[PDB]
Amino acid sequence: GPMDASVEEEGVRRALDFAVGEYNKASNDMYHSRALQVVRARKQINAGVNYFLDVELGRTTCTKTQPNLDNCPFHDQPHLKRKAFCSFQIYAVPWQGTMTLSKSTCQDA
């Protein structure tokens, strides 16, 4: 397409978790950020699958040291939540078991 896709789709959800994981891995934040909301999801199928995700992210109260990232509420202070808007492009070739982040551009939302 890219054609419309939904966070309801297993593949979109796997690409999201992958992208958000790369985002945390790359940041200098002592704390975990998570996706607030996928505002737009699209995918394109050819030699692989390209996912295009527009995502709002926010900072949580869980340190990245946390072995438990299962329950991390966003900050209720806007200058601590620091809401970000991100466009991720994830390239997956599921039948070869690969997934790479082709593009990640994030700024204040």
> How many distinct structural domains can be found in the chain?
1
Coil, strand or helix at 28: coil
Residue 90: enclosing H or E segment and its boundaries?
Answer: strand 84-93
Collapsed DSSP state (helix, strand, coil) of residue 77: coil
Resolution, in Å, please?
A: 2.0
The CATH number of the domain holding residue 88 is: 3.10.450.10
Distance (Å, whole) CA 60 – CA 74: 4
3-state secondary structure of 45: strand
Domain with 30, as residue range(s), is 1-109
CB atoms within 10 A of CB 89: 19
